[PDB]
Write an enzyme that holds these catalytic residues in place. Sequence first.
Site, PDB file in Angstrom:
ATOM      1  CG  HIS A 157      -1.887   1.161   1.287  1.00 52.92           C
ATOM      2  ND1 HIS A 157      -2.940   1.308   0.408  1.00 52.92           N
ATOM      3  CD2 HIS A 157      -1.982   2.196   2.160  1.00 52.92           C
ATOM      4  CE1 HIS A 157      -3.622   2.400   0.714  1.00 52.92           C
ATOM      5  NE2 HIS A 157      -3.064   2.955   1.778  1.00 52.92           N
TER       6      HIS A 157
HETATM    7  C1  LIG Z   1       5.455   9.421   6.805  1.00 49.21           C
HETATM    8  C2  LIG Z   1       4.901   8.019   6.822  1.00 49.21           C
HETATM    9  C3  LIG Z   1       4.735   7.283   5.678  1.00 49.21           C
HETATM   10  C4  LIG Z   1       4.210   5.977   5.692  1.00 49.21           C
HETATM   11  N1  LIG Z   1       4.076   5.306   4.524  1.00 49.21           N
HETATM   12  C5  LIG Z   1       3.601   4.113   4.544  1.00 49.21           C
HETATM   13  C6  LIG Z   1       3.440   3.378   3.273  1.00 49.21           C
HETATM   14  O1  LIG Z   1       3.739   3.851   2.205  1.00 49.21           O
HETATM   15  N2  LIG Z   1       2.915   2.124   3.415  1.00 49.21           N
HETATM   16  C7  LIG Z   1       2.538   1.504   4.612  1.00 49.21           C
HETATM   17  O2  LIG Z   1       2.075   0.362   4.601  1.00 49.21           O
HETATM   18  N3  LIG Z   1       2.709   2.212   5.752  1.00 49.21           N
HETATM   19  C8  LIG Z   1       3.197   3.426   5.735  1.00 49.21           C
HETATM   20  N4  LIG Z   1       3.334   4.114   6.908  1.00 49.21           N
HETATM   21  C9  LIG Z   1       2.939   3.427   8.148  1.00 49.21           C
HETATM   22  C10 LIG Z   1       1.437   3.463   8.427  1.00 49.21           C
HETATM   23  O3  LIG Z   1       1.033   4.819   8.390  1.00 49.21           O
HETATM   24  C11 LIG Z   1       1.193   2.771   9.781  1.00 49.21           C
HETATM   25  O4  LIG Z   1       1.942   1.555   9.824  1.00 49.21           O
HETATM   26  C12 LIG Z   1      -0.304   2.520  10.056  1.00 49.21           C
HETATM   27  O5  LIG Z   1      -0.992   3.749   9.963  1.00 49.21           O
HETATM   28  C13 LIG Z   1      -0.452   1.986  11.463  1.00 49.21           C
HETATM   29  O6  LIG Z   1      -1.792   1.615  11.666  1.00 49.21           O
HETATM   30  P1  LIG Z   1      -2.391   1.479  13.173  1.00 49.21           P
HETATM   31  O7  LIG Z   1      -3.800   1.054  13.051  1.00 49.21           O
HETATM   32  O8  LIG Z   1      -1.393   0.747  14.024  1.00 49.21           O
HETATM   33  O9  LIG Z   1      -2.367   3.029  13.685  1.00 49.21           O
HETATM   34  P2  LIG Z   1      -2.700   4.442  12.977  1.00 49.21           P
HETATM   35  O10 LIG Z   1      -3.096   4.220  11.556  1.00 49.21           O
HETATM   36  O11 LIG Z   1      -1.562   5.338  13.363  1.00 49.21           O
HETATM   37  O12 LIG Z   1      -3.983   4.956  13.848  1.00 49.21           O
HETATM   38  C14 LIG Z   1      -3.853   5.204  15.242  1.00 49.21           C
HETATM   39  C15 LIG Z   1      -4.890   6.263  15.586  1.00 49.21           C
HETATM   40  O13 LIG Z   1      -5.079   6.353  17.007  1.00 49.21           O
HETATM   41  C16 LIG Z   1      -5.303   7.679  17.379  1.00 49.21           C
HETATM   42  N5  LIG Z   1      -5.022   7.761  18.790  1.00 49.21           N
HETATM   43  C17 LIG Z   1      -3.804   7.727  19.396  1.00 49.21           C
HETATM   44  N6  LIG Z   1      -3.876   7.804  20.689  1.00 49.21           N
HETATM   45  C18 LIG Z   1      -5.213   7.874  20.980  1.00 49.21           C
HETATM   46  C19 LIG Z   1      -5.958   7.968  22.178  1.00 49.21           C
HETATM   47  N7  LIG Z   1      -5.409   7.987  23.398  1.00 49.21           N
HETATM   48  N8  LIG Z   1      -7.296   8.035  22.092  1.00 49.21           N
HETATM   49  C20 LIG Z   1      -7.857   8.010  20.894  1.00 49.21           C
HETATM   50  N9  LIG Z   1      -7.264   7.930  19.717  1.00 49.21           N
HETATM   51  C21 LIG Z   1      -5.943   7.854  19.806  1.00 49.21           C
HETATM   52  C22 LIG Z   1      -4.428   8.481  16.406  1.00 49.21           C
HETATM   53  O14 LIG Z   1      -4.898   9.777  16.220  1.00 49.21           O
HETATM   54  C23 LIG Z   1      -4.530   7.672  15.103  1.00 49.21           C
HETATM   55  O15 LIG Z   1      -5.606   8.088  14.290  1.00 49.21           O
HETATM   56  C24 LIG Z   1       3.840   5.392   6.918  1.00 49.21           C
HETATM   57  C25 LIG Z   1       4.013   6.140   8.079  1.00 49.21           C
HETATM   58  C26 LIG Z   1       4.517   7.418   8.050  1.00 49.21           C
HETATM   59  C27 LIG Z   1       4.680   8.164   9.342  1.00 49.21           C
END
Ligand SMILES: Cc1cc2nc3c(=O)[nH]c(=O)nc-3n(C[C@H](O)[C@H](O)[C@H](O)COP(=O)(O)OP(=O)(O)OC[C@H]3O[C@@H](n4cnc5c(N)ncnc54)[C@H](O)[C@@H]3O)c2cc1C
Lengths: 489, 486
Positions: free
Chosen positions: B460
Amino acid sequence: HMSKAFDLVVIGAGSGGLEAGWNAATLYGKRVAVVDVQTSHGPPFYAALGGTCVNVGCVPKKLMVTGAQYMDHLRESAGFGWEFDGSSVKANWKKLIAAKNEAVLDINKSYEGMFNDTEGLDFFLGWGSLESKNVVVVRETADPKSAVKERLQADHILLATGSWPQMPAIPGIEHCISSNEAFYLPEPPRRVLTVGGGFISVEFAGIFNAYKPPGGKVTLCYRNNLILRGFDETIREEVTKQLTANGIEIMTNENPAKVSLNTDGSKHVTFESGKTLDVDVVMMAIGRIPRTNDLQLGNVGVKLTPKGGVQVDEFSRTNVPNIYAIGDITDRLMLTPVAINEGAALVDTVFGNKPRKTDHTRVASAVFSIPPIGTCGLIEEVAAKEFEKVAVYMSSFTPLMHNISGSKYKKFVAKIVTNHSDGTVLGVHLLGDGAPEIIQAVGVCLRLNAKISDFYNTIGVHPTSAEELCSMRTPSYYYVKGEKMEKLP
Amino acid sequence: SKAFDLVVIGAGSGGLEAGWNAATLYGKRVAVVDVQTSHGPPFYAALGGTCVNVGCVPKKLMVTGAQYMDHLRESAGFGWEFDGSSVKANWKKLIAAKNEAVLDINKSYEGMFNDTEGLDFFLGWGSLESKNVVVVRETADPKSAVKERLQADHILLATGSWPQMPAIPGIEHCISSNEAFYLPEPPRRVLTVGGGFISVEFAGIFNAYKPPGGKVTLCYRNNLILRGFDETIREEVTKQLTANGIEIMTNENPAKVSLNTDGSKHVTFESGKTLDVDVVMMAIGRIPRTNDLQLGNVGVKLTPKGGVQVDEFSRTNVPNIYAIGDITDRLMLTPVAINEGAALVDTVFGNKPRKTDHTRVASAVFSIPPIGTCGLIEEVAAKEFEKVAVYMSSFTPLMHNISGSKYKKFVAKIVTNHSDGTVLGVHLLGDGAPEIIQAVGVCLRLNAKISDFYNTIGVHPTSAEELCSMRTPSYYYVKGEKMEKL
Ligand SMILES: Cc1cc2nc3c(=O)[nH]c(=O)nc-3n(C[C@H](O)[C@H](O)[C@H](O)COP(=O)(O)OP(=O)(O)OC[C@H]3O[C@@H](n4cnc5c(N)ncnc54)[C@H](O)[C@@H]3O)c2cc1C
Ligand SMILES: Cc1cc2nc3c(=O)[nH]c(=O)nc-3n(C[C@H](O)[C@H](O)[C@H](O)COP(=O)(O)OP(=O)(O)OC[C@H]3O[C@@H](n4cnc5c(N)ncnc54)[C@H](O)[C@@H]3O)c2cc1C
Ligand SMILES: C[C@H]1C[C@@H]2CNC[C@@H]2N1C(=O)C(C)(C)C
Ligand SMILES: [Br-]
Ligand SMILES: [Br-]
Ligand SMILES: [Br-]
Ligand SMILES: [Br-]
Ligand code: NA
């Protein structure tokens, strides 16, 4: 005002938590609550409804890399006969950022609409934390003394709060930014230093390099010898040469000691080596750490690993029976599709009575550097530790369109690593335009235990870069009990 | 007179794989005959084959060139500014660059002969004099001067194919793809005749390089172009070619062509409609190139369609005479011809009988936007299996909402045997489709099921990850009839 009761409360409406929530409600009829701190992208909290990928991650960054690629297209078109006023060419960063903001906000609103619409899938705005085994509290801020907005009773609780940029403790760190702020800079920096050797530092260096104003310069620094630890070493070396060939300075074995402001307000960076560099922006991209501190996990006793992530088993269970964790908070593979897969597997296991665990091996992934990387599976030095005899098949060729384009430095590299005992493919690593799209079906192949002969028996599509994966049948070299050699003894 | 283990008539894709493999892998003595040592008029094909000289290679370069018309316009949505009125497309520079890149490959094939033991090249026109003798004459005329007499234990026919031209009054005022590669000027108005990949690909090329006020028309005698490809995709690419300025005339067929006083061409269709153009390029098919081989001397049998008849091991009816590539009038692709040559040499000069698999062959159309495909289209599968599922995804990718080319829908379709989930075919339309499909060809050799695709973790963000997010069929074929529910 009464608390509300749910089957599952999800903390974090990101890649994993949305997948788990949607599926539990729509596939299995559960009542689900999802918490996030912000309804749409950007400051103050950067991530929001939809997660890090949607708001300040994969989706905006891929749009900006695409915009950056046009610097290469505009120049390369002339080899094919295209003529235009080169002197009139301007990269308008404000228009890129405005277009990106609009696309991201559209996804925000579509997510908000889903919640307002979907039976048994409810959204709550604020900061979620763990009060007790079966109560999530939503507060106005991350401070646990801020006001209570809701209490959510939950039979099951999912931790999916993601990660956050790590900043080093150096004098003048207040003068630097992270990738979060980079997405919102008002003007493109004339001189920028990106700090770190990982995919975020590299990808951003390519973006800034295409949009820099006249007379600009992008510098990437990395504290060790070679960027992109974890990727194929041949690709690590070739991606450096090609980044350099596009005008990016790559300072290896260098690390900032301190940052100060010059009298004109530019940043004056002093390295541990004593070298100095003047820049307009310092973007830190040295790593990302799991967001645990605000969940008050001590209240119920959720164990963290030494490294700092929530400890989980193969089914994403914590040490507390009904509390689970997926995604970047587990401080393992920080990819969106892994989080989504863990979210779907957890819901099938817990509510679907069809158990299932995520396969963390042979995950395909990409780097959207210019030129890009695609990879699935093991690098050769890792495989050489696990298998007696490893073969490496390697093809490195300049595609023919770059005989004409000018950019002869744009070599395409394809490497296949095998268990030479039975020919099983352990890893495929690619560098060059198209590599992210090519690798995806390679991932299905490795899940099907493809051998090198399944690749070689396949008839190529001609002319493509990818057909070179299907015409390799003699190893370039081997590893025998871990020792590299051109030939078997 | 000279003696050889293998004589190959035609230094093309299949003939050069078989020659070099016979020489360097089995130490045989090999002679390879071709009419020309580099590309271009008068004979067009040459050392290296159709693909190298007037086929895949130059067309890929020129298609790459035509894509910059879209890149220049789309760059604006990502903030790129420049003087749009200053833009022009220099065709001669394109042709000149293409000619040099092709010549470089011509010369490299030359050094290959000079550097390889047991591998000799002969210039001229080869034909079968007797069962173990190949003659090389000065011209295609079977009475021109004999230059060489090569005696062979084995003879391989690999002379490929040639453009088909219909018997209509004025056909001589029409060109084929051969001459399109060498046009001095990009045509201002051009008609491409045919529904196949060559008509479609050149249409995209002329469309980008046409001078101001220009127009490209494609005509085709039946209702929908690109017969043999997925039907959703034939309909979509028609729409996206039309969105980019190309006129598609379906159900129309030229009946005659005549010369106008200004040098342009007047085309009359069977329907009575007329069209004035500068160039008429016929692309209605390619036919096996058998006529100059004097097959009548040895009695090599031809199928009713005109292909040299072969078995699964490329053997004709005459022992020690073989035929591979487009001259067998089957799948006309360069990688198929190579595969056929290598299997033949493995069978004849090694202890390794080997036949080519003509099923599940991935291939591509370099139209703008391009096609990538492997395996069966849904209506063919519906005749072979009782229950067929079709999974489908089709939307405009995000980048093209910003670029402004919002017509650019990406299409991904998976065809399964619904009885066991076995993937029978995959069909793609949109940027990157030719590259995405390659490893799919590998999946089909492992008898992948739809669940193997869906259970794989996606990359992705990409177009390719769409192939791993399709869980639910869009519709089905049961006993051959299309229906949305089971
Ligand atoms: C610059 C950058 C580029 C990236 N590019 C890629 C890519 O090309 N391909 C890929 O596969 N991955 C990529 N990633 C990684 C990807 O964004 C993450 O691996 C993925 O978003 C993680 O998913 P998650 O569900 O663990 O958390 P996230 O998608 O980070 O969601 C966590 C959510 O929890 C919320 N939250 C946090 N604390 C609290 C709280 N106490 N109460 C309520 N809400 C809270 C946050 O606001 C956030 O919306 C990239 C990351 C970055 C930083
Ligand atoms: C415009 C165009 C575009 C194409 N694009 C693609 C593509 O993208 N991908 C793909 O897979 N396929 C493509 N093809 C098809 C591909 O070019 C052919 O399938 C392939 O070249 C067939 O190989 P072959 O070994 O049969 O013979 P060829 O490669 O055609 O070689 C035959 C050779 O024999 C020589 N010859 C002929 N008669 C004699 C004689 N009497 N004596 C001596 N020598 C003789 C010819 O000069 C020629 O060099 C394309 C074809 C065309 C026309
Ligand atoms: C440049 C090479 C390798 C590229 C990858 N596959 C297509 C390209 N090539 C060729 O087809 C030739 C014929 C020139 C060998
Ligand atoms: Br700007
Ligand atoms: Br093999
Ligand atoms: Br037609
Ligand atoms: Br039709
Ligand atoms: Na190529």
